[PDB]
């Protein structure tokens, strides 16, 4: 159970790593994004 | 514990979907959004 | 490892509040965003 709440959770940093990088892209325009 | 953090991480899971989601609605123009 | 994942977690919660307010602010347009 733990190991694979550990899974979920990296999981979930990754998915949430990559919102903060395209969000941080559409409030700041970058490339024109 | 384990049985609270699997539901925590559920509702996040649900939450990442979704932002995913409006996120990539943005990204896309999706519907003119 | 269960008291590390709930830290985890709760930077998640964290992670994930701000990204709602922020995809909220991107989709309604709030104060100009």
Known sequence: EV???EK???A???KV???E???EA???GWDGR
Chains 1, 2, 3 share one sequence.
């Open 3 to 5: 190991e694979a709440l």
């Open 8 to 10: 979920k959770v990296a």
């Open 12 to 14: 979930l940093e990754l």
């Open 17 to 19: 790593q990559k919102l």
């Open 21 to 23: 990088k395209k969000v």
């Open 26 to 28: 559409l409030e700041h």
